[PDB]
Amino acid sequence: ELFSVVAFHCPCSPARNYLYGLAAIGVPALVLFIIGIILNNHTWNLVAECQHRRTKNCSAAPTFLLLSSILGRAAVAPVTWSVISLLRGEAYVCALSEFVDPSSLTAREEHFPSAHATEILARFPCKENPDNLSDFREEVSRRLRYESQLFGWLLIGVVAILVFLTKCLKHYCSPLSYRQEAYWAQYRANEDQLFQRTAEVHSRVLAANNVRRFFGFVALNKDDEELIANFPVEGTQPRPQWNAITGVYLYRENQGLPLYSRLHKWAQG
Amino acid sequence: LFSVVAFHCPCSPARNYLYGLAAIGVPALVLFIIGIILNNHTWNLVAECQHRRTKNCSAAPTFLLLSSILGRAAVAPVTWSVISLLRGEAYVCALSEFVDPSSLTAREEHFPSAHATEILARFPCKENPDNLSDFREEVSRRLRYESQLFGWLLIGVVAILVFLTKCLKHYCSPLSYRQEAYWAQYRANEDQLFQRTAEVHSRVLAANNVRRFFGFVALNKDDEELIANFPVEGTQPRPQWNAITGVYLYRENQGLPLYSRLHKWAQG
Amino acid sequence: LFSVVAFHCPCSPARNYLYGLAAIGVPALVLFIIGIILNNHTWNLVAECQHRRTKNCSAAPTFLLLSSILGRAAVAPVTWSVISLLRGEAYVCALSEFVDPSSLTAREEHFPSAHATEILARFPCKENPDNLSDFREEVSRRLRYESQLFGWLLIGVVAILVFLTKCLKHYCSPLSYRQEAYWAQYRANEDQLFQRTAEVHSRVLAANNVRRFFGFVALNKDDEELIANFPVEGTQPRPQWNAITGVYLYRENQGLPLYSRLHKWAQG
Amino acid sequence: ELFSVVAFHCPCSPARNYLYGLAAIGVPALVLFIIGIILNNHTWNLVAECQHRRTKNCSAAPTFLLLSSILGRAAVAPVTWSVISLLRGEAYVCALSEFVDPSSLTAREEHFPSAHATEILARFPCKENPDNLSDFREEVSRRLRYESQLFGWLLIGVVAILVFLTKCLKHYCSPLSYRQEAYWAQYRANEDQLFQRTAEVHSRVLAANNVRRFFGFVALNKDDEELIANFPVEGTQPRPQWNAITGVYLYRENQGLPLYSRLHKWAQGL
Amino acid sequence: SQELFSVVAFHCPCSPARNYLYGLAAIGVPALVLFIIGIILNNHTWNLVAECQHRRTKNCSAAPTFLLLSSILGRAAVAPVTWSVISLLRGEAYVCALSEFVDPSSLTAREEHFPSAHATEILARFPCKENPDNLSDFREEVSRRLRYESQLFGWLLIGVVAILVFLTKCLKHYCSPLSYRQEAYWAQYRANEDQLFQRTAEVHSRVLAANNVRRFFGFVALNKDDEELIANFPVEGTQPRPQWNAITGVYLYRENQGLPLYSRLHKWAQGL
Amino acid sequence: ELFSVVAFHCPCSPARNYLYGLAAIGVPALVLFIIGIILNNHTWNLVAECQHRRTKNCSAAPTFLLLSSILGRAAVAPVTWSVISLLRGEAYVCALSEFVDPSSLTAREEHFPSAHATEILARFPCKENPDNLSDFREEVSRRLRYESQLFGWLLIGVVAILVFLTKCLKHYCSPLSYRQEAYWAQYRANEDQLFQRTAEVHSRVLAANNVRRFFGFVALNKDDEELIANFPVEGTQPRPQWNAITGVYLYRENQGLPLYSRLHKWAQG
Amino acid sequence: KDVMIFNGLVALGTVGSQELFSVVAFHCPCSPARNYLYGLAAIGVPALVLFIIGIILNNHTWNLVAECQHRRTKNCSAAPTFLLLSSILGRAAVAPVTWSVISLLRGEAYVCALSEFVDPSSLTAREEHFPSAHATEILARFPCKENPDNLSDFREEVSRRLRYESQLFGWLLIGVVAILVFLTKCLKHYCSPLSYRQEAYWAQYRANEDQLFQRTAEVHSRVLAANNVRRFFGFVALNKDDEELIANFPVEGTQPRPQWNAITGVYLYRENQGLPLYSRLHKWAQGL
């Protein structure tokens, strides 16, 4: 059971668990955050922009709109994991168990020992406390869980406000009516489907034309014969030609009619 | 799961009413913010503030539409505020510390006055002495009454508002209601066909660009008719897009009504 | 689900009787509203004042229509109020504090006179000493009788009201029921095919507008014949639309009975 | 119950379990690491590269860019086993229970004996501890499990950075845009799967061409009869021809056009 | 089968100088039986035998035999190892074997309460639980050290094999004159030829059986599918023993005119 | 059930149970050995071969290898039953219970009575022993059961080697390459299946003619008429011709071509 | 084959019946010189009876009698008698043997038998304690399991030693029948004039002819009866199948009485001038 593997087990110890809780929640967020950048294609072409120029010709301000998109899109993974842990509250209570002031404790009279304070409070999350302090143990358990949930509900509130400000300003300051942007956002996600689809077909066709010249024939299934028959290949596309359809693109217009993707710009020569 | 969003009452003085505010206000706020974004009637309104850059249009025409934005998006917070009030757990945890010890009933003068607020704080969590359980049960019902009381009357004031808004809407709209019904069926019919054509006119332009690169575009059996039946030569000008976005209030043309800016653009 | 919509008595004097009114009347009140909104007869009756703004129609001709509208929507208030009265939950919670202790019998005088109302208020919540269980039981059984007695005669009131009105409606109306059955069927049938024609005529105009913008419209197979079958040129003017909505009471034209304003408009 | 056999059994004995901790975690890691190298086709054409030249003229500049890929595509398997063990915590606690400082125990007063501290601490993972020290064990067990679970999470972080570091350099230092590399990635697999598929068929046709000469006829299934009727062969492929499509290929452009596989380089006749 | 498993299951005889004999038999012999099965099923061992039979002069040197002999054991020594390893990891076999060899003074967890009257006898009784209750702590102590010593060796044995397999695989590719890719085709050819051979041998067997029965009974009875076999695959006679004698024997890549021959049969198909 | 009846029941009695153990093991082995000989077809033509010559015309040496095949094929059942009994150990303990030397007994101080050594040692397997010597009954049982399992494992080992030894020499000493034996074996199995299949068809057709000749007709199922029409009988086959295709057969060549059975030799004319 | 399954069901049938018999109805009469006779009858009587239904139900048995009564000279050759006698026993005499062995194997049948013969002085593990007058009587009560606990010690050894004898005796019986079957099969093939392939073909033919004979005979009865119905009514009503038979099977008539007698009895296996004849029925057709 992988649930038992990644389960949050609180090491009840002073000055030790908050260090653990920091690395038991932040690190999965870091992994989740890293995944978002890696998979999002909007960051490779941004990287690819930095490699071809080798000079830093392009200004930062035009690229900041796209730079905020990769971080923004990938920011769901940390938030949806930072929030879920906070609401569960197990992460926080084990983290902040040892900072509770014994003097400010409530629900009971001043019978809390002060010989070794942090040691007893640190052991609260694991329930390894004498029942004579069970009221104290429960009181801190509830109060600390309260701050987690209050922080958790605050966290989701802040994200919602940020999204509202982001989308409202993005539509306001963009120079295209939002209906056109929907068509544009229905293009880049449509071109990439066709471009990936023909990438294999013009690869497999080029694969068969290589094996055949070696073996003397090519094994194929019933469908693959249609690929060779319908779509013949003659050669390969030049490397600079590949260089002209990678990078970032920001609504460069031609003659008064838009070009929606950098490939479309190259399709006009 | 429901366990994560489940209401856990922190039985503490001057603290739980903060939590109830957050555990109810924020989910209400997050629903309301969701409502605005999804409702497409606000973006063109936002886009309306952009193209003019002058505010030529007065607020009076906008106000009739602006109500339809917040109101149509206010259903989600209301149905979430109601259930929380009807459930009652949030309210009792909210006002437990404000119960007057003097107004306590169903028992003799046995409730301690040493730390009333502290004792009153721990009522929602069953952290109470059995001797005070009668007091706890009394406030467990008196407080739950107010929540269920507030829930029902807040439902009623909402309910009459729907009737008041709808009747006034039919009272103030110059066109007859049955014609408005046709207008409602036209907005859905145009939006679907426009959206359905948005994908197709995107795909045809998509294939007409990949082909220039690879030399051929791989299409399945059904997408093949898309290229054959629907050929395009280019794109549409930005001003042309800029003339069919925004708000529209029943501009009549030579005795012929127009129902959408696109229709108004279709008449030239 | 059903847990949220339930009755829980606040065992408090001068407070529970408010809850009983709120916990039943308001759910009945909203159900009363809902019937009005769904019915289409209200808006045209509402729209009648809009097209005149002068009170052209007198009170006597228009008073006849008002009777039918309220009764149709009155189904929800009566289909719910009597059900709660059958359970008797509202009555026992509401008027328990107002039960006169003098009429209490079938037991010796044991109920305290210090707080008679307060003890009475806590009966529904099962909070009562076993010595007063007899006092609780007698009133609980008495209130359940009165609630059911009240609830049962409500059904009879409904039963007689529909019966007398139906013959009165037949007697008052100058039309035979066989004539009324056909006429009523016409409205219930002409509306349905009016709505279906509305969408088809809505889509056809919608398709034409998009084509003038994109250049081609992506329709399914069934929509393809829609363009071929029903091609339109423009729309219908607002006065033509206005001549449809409103109320109508069986005008006659040279011995030809007309059954709808549309039929009245059909002859020109 | 095959998983039950490989289950961890901590030998509670001083200076002994950490050896077992190593050899019951390292060895399956070593086995998983070796498997990654063996099954990875990119490691054989590396070996066959230095084999046929017999001189090692080529420098380390082209080798290191591939050698990392050999381990990288294979070193993931040991790590996803090394991290899993650390998260479970069983491997570490038994390994290091001997080294716990007898002066660093808390949650109890000075009740730890000093006669054989290492010995008594060694038996903590086996729960064979007298009930007068049950507080001590539940302190050491939970403390050591922290150290493991901290190391496991940290190790995941280091891979979570090395992958992102590598994926950036592999796209910033390579002379090809990523969209072209995806094609070059979609071509290496497209050719190899065709090659394996066509190798099997040209094997069977050659086989059926010899068995016939030994029996006068060949038994073939109904669908296999189509194979012989479609893909006739005339002989075998010479060894030097088989020796020019084995090895490492590094983006040799031809007359201004690219070649994506070493086979492709031979396909143009080079 | 719960009864069959119960028969083979280990039953340690707690007695000195006796159990490790059984432990040797209870693991060694099933390993030996598995190893013998590995030899017989390995088709490469027979044409190896047939090679040592037909030539009668030991024509082949050590190098042609050594390269093949490695494949004989490698494809067969897997079965003993995965049985020896599985036994060691279980640890029951080892603890029964060495229960009479731990040094009493090396024991711990208890003071010098270990009797020295007949040390070997009492130690040997540990695996079968047949121990006095006062030495139950010692019983568990030895029951764990010996489990360890088995388990460490069990894991160590797997590691050594996982090195030899990698070393053997790497050496073969570096030493053979063929490219690794051409060997894959060569491996993909022996399987196709063998499967076609065995399948087509049956058909040329049944036809000969059908032809001979017809001469005796006067006719032959065939199933629906066998009817096609007689017409589609007619035979005229048998094949001489020397013809059968040119295709059974180890073959190591004799190239012809610069074009390879991939098996004895292929060399015969060219009449060489 | 059947297993309950044939369940071993050790007769605890001196000088008597080892007789029972032999019969309760040997007889099941002897019976199973007979079934191996009886069902095997290569044993009857061996006997039938002696019928025709009646004078030992053929030498015993060439026919010896067949005798190696008949014993080897049949011996699987006795061994697989002898081994199972040895591994179970029930047979052996009751067989040798009363032969355990009291002097060599261990795991107990010398309380073993000598008044009836054999008798009390005979009763050990059947729980009819004093509880004061219960540890001995466990000690003697475990040592004896150890001896049984060692013999069982040694026996299966020797059978394992002999199977290999008789299969390494058979290929070596046979005059044919092992592949020819593959065809020869696949031919024999094909011949017998086809030969037996035609016998049913030939008989059913022949019986039809006799019944038709005597009722004037025959009652047939759906496929019988197909059998009658497709395969008509023209008579029977002489006995001496049948005799030429019975009996053992060694590989004999004709004009440089093999003949794989007497039926083949007969079919060649 | 078909023969083995036919025997197997019978072997299972008696074993189950023996298990059923040993539960509901077997109570050893613990009375001297009464259990001994009871024990012997508890084995032989089912054995002798079960052998009898084996003979009666065997069709080939009356074939032997028919020839013996017809020939009155025992002119049947040794080989056909070897075939039939080894056929009936192999098909019938199996059932008593299986009952006999399982009865011995369980031992409750035998333990009653020699309980009388048990020597009081042959007992061990203690001094012999039995009166010279009631020694036989007390032993007879051992199998009932009602013996006093004082005599339980001596009873278990006696009830087991006989149980030892029964299982050993039952096993020894299995050896004899197993050897005999092996001995007979060799004698059957050695003394037969034709090889086993001939014997296989012949016995395989015998089943097919008699199976064909039975099916035809039932049909011939129906068609002959139907034709006489037509003669007695002038019309016949038939279903789909039977009506096809009358149109497809002409009525040859009534066969001569000697012809029926010629096709019953033992088979002389006289080769028709070298051409084999596998039954009397085959000879009759080839004879004419």
Numbering used by the authors:
A (entry chain G), F (entry chain D): 37 to 305
B (entry chain H), C (entry chain I): 38 to 305
D (entry chain F): 37 to 306
E (entry chain E): 35 to 306
G (entry chain C): 19 to 306
What does the paper say about this structure?
The calcium homeostasis modulators (CALHM) constitute one family of large pore channels that contains six members in humans. Here, we investigated whether these placental paralogs would form heteromers and characterized heteromeric complexes consisting of CALHM2 and CALHM4 subunits using specific binders as fiducial markers.
In both datasets, the position of CALHM4 subunits is marked by the binding of SbC4 to the extracellular part of the protein, whereas in the dataset containing both sybodies, SbC2 additionally labels CALHM2 subunits. In both datasets, the two positions uniformly occupied by CALHM4 (referred to as 1 and 2 when numbered in a counterclockwise direction from the extracellular side) are well-defined and clearly discernable by SbC4 bound to its extracellular epitope. Similarly, the seven following positions (3-9), occupied by CALHM2, are well defined, whereas the two positions adjacent to the two CALHM4 subunits in a clockwise direction (11 and 10), which contain CALHM2 or 4 at different ratios are of somewhat lower resolution due to the averaging of two different subunits.
